[PDB]
Homo-oligomer: 334 residues x 4
């Protein structure tokens, strides 16, 4: 049994090789943005409401055309066989069973068709390739396999400088491969090429500037993920949670606005919701659970997060996620 997400990190620390734990845990540069993701959530305080009807509290939301059990999805994390032999299949099975969308990576270590066959609500994360034709063929594969959204990651014109990995001389084990294969910087023209090629909602992941959020809506995006890529891309990039409220106001309901970076509890989900998020992504904790106990581990994590979200919502007087979005917050110190 685990009673917090912190329980699982210690467990994953135990089991994983040091270099692999560092690949997972690390950020770019001095890890300023990595730390700031946590600092930013810790400074947010919720103003709960009392004495409201809680006879039918529900944590469900509708997003991109389908119901989800929680306002949460599993973030795209590449090469999950690094953490457990069943890799993406273990995580996708647990996500399916929990009613949580699972984001299949361009750099998955099991093919996207195999992961989609698990069922559930798969999304597909796109990295822009070489040339437009192969990029669009990846999108077409994902759509043909039943993925329900295209999560276009737009904050990686190239990879950030992860000093832990450089110092470790970390490289992919020979037994881990990019299973979708036998890359180039994305632009707004790339976004349009994707939008024109699919009927699925296109979700732009890695948006931080208010003007980019507006332009995303103008570009026909169905959603954005306000994100600094877990502090792994620009070191010194603002945390998404610090831009979220401004961005939600600027898009004024024109697309779904998700956030990620440092979500470590149901209370953190509540904070993100109160700042205006439609839903959150969760990355590293899902991999901790995967490393610690495979599919059963991820199941326990999602069960824990589900109870924490329900608990936080009720304690704050919210019978629905919509009500949680109307909560006010106060920024504190430390």
């Amino acid at each position: 049994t685990y009673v917090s997400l912190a329980d699982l990190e210690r467990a994953a620390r135990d089991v994983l090789p040091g270099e692999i734990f560092d690949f997972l845990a690390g950020g770019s540069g001095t890890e300023a943005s990595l730390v700031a993701n946590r600092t930013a959530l810790e400074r947010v305080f919720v103003i709960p409401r009392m004495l409201r009807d809680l006879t039918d509290v529900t944590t469900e939301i509708d997003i991109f055309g389908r119901r989800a059990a929680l306002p949460m999805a599993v973030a795209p994390v590449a090469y999950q066989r690094l953490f457990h032999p069943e890799g993406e299949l273990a995580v996708a099975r647990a996500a399916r069973d929990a009613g949580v969308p699972y984001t299949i990576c361009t750099l998955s270590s099991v093919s996207l068709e195999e992961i989609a066959a698990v069922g559930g609500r798969p999304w597909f994360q796109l990295y822009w390739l070489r040339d437009e034709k192969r990029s669009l063929d990846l999108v077409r594969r994902a759509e043909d396999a039943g993925c329900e959204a295209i999560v276009f990651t737009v904050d990686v014109p190239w990879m950030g400088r992860r000093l832990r990995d450089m110092r470790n001389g970390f490289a992919l084990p020979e037994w881990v491969t990019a299973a979708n294969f036998d890359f180039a910087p994305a632009t707004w023209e790339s976004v349009e090429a994707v939008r024109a090629h699919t009927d699925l909602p296109v979700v732009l992941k890695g948006i931080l500037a208010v003007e980019d959020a507006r332009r995303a809506v103008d570009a026909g995006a169905g959603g954005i993920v306000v994100s600094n890529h877990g502090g792994r891309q620009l070191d010194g990039a603002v945390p998404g949670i610090e831009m979220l409220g401004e961005i939600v106001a600027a898009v004024s309901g024109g697309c779904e606005v998700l956030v990620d970076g440092g979500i470590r509890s149901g209370g953190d989900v509540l904070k993100a919701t109160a700042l205006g998020a439609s839903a959150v992504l969760v990355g590293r904790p899902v991999m901790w659970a995967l490393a610690a106990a495979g599919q059963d581990g991820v199941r326990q994590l999602l069960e824990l997060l589900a109870e924490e979200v329900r608990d936080a919502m009720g304690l704050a007087g919210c019978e629905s996620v919509g009500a949680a979005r109307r909560l006010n917050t106060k920024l504190g110190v430390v």
Copy 2:
């Protein structure tokens, strides 16, 4: 002899079983709100006035129809026999002798009639039950026994997740029982049912949102306690002391506004008063004193707090608690 409230915590640490000290000390989740109650008071600085007449300094107030010796009451704390064999009777006797109201708990480990028989100024704290009829019968019992106010706790639709207790596998000893017995979420309709059933002032404990404070006045409450339940309910709830000034302005004298969470000295009482509170509740320190030295311990604590309140008021140029409410404050760093 003790010279601060911190003296008593160390003493209680000595004597109590670890699990019981943790039950008392702990908060929910990561204990962010528990810590923030203290941080919030430590950031408040008072601007004292000089050269005022202090020939008749008095710490007395009138509240809910009776005089109190200090602008303070003992907070409701369940199951006080956990901390000393005389439990609630020891605390209520010391409170009586000090001229301080004592809040009798729904979950008291000595029956409310026995505690009320001690005399003094007993209040009764209500948790909403099963059905309206038994809830109202608890209120009627309290009124029949001479309680002078009903403190309706409204921030517990269910109990927060106290991780210390879960990790300890903490459970009530067989020798501790809910002596008032041989629960359901409260709503505004529950508040109205109570108000219609008693002539006693109804005080809503656990209010943090400004709109809930206004609605409390509209609902006929005689008071509110601005409170995040000592950081034991929603982890990430704002401290009451951070909402107090706004709330006092919004109710504009329509009801008494009390505050609790982290009050650990007479200087802290002065800060709360200067921010607009009518009075404070004090929880954990009263239990420290109870654990350390029973009734005599609680007596010493209340004597110490009485001298600290008188000292702080005079040093700040206040001959009355009303004058202290007109003090200005400045928010500092750390």
Copy 3:
């Protein structure tokens, strides 16, 4: 040789009995205000000016009718024989030689007439007595002995609770006495009685509220000291340096505005000046120097402070203390 004021504290730590070092170093309550005096100065940053004429840099000021060599005076500190056998005479001699005013205490351990006979620029600090007649006789003694200002301390209706002393069971050694003798709370009426009884400037020490500073000017004060008494009176009182700018604006040249609390370098003097102070008082460091090396120690301290003030002023482009008062500041973090 000493290169900072911190050098001297370590030296005084060496030589003094622990209880006496604690009497000197300590504050009231939790020492929040003691620490905040330092925090507040450390958050202030100066915006220096460049390329100004520094051919005749002078640190001199005129205050209360006489020239002083620095914008600084020795703060009133009672019972200086606690720290060195020559007590007040050693400090007053060093102050005289440095061209710095020395404040003789009501509770001096050498008689005020003996200390005044040293020469220099003595001020006299008044604590209000028993009855108006003896208070005024103390003032008359001081004036007859050649004191040039009456520093009326107004923040001590009674002494703050110094927990170090209580825990130490600290008491005056039999060999230390209040040499001016063989107390009651002051009011504005007391201030008027003093003002009517002397032609010397009356300076009110311990003012923190803006309205009290205004009333001081209205009352005929020649100056005020913006001060929380070194964190020894109300624990939680705002630092004087945090109120100084507001107070200087409110009195708009109607009286001299001095500040004290935590001044530990020439750079700190510059910060106080830039915030608008006429001059500062320095307390504990003078006693460190006295304890460490008697009169010669205090001489070295004042020489060090004089060089640091001159250095800071020049580096900031100020040829006079008046120019330093026109410097701008920026408040930082930590």
Copy 4:
């Protein structure tokens, strides 16, 4: 190989005598301004832009009539033979090869003519001398030798009090000399004398007040360096990075605005650019690299900084330094 600038500091720590490492590392007084230079950069977060064309990312700028490879120059640091036997020649060679301007010091330990003969883009830093005639002859020498700008340091009417050096009794080794020789405070009249005597751009280094920046433009300066001299002059002077935005707005393109103090990575260069700087100076890290590995060390440092600047710019969506100046920032906590 080094992967950050912090790698090099540890290396320099190894090799240098303690007193020399302290001369390099230290600040004046309590080193408040030294620490604040770093704190100030760490509080700045960049808001990156996405999906922009990065097909021709360039870190080049034009400044003072010539192209530079990066928006950076080597800061003036006196007596570089203290750190390596080749001193200034090693650094100037590496700077030349990297396409970075090198600032030759008035107090260089190799003559300015020898360093200029290395080639590249030498600037010359002026300290005002004794009399106008010799000051101007130093300027004339620099111009005759091919220096392209005069960096007039204006924040040293005299040297700050470096307590590390005093405590170390640090003095120039006999084998290190001021090679340009066989000083007086500068004023605006000195600036005019220099401006009238050369056609080179005059750059005023050590400006912090907005009014001084304006006056610099009015005085005919071609640039300013917003700087508190690495925390080595007035202790308590605001960091340049805290004044930079205000200053850039006030001069409104009237001169180049550079900044220095604490630049330790390409991300830090990006922050300075986003706040409006034309370019930065880098001081201590260049000396770390010099101490650690001579010319090759400085080459590796500049290669590392060049890759970090390119990386940060691209991750932030900037194909040019001009685009980086249009980035927005958000100030955070810690």
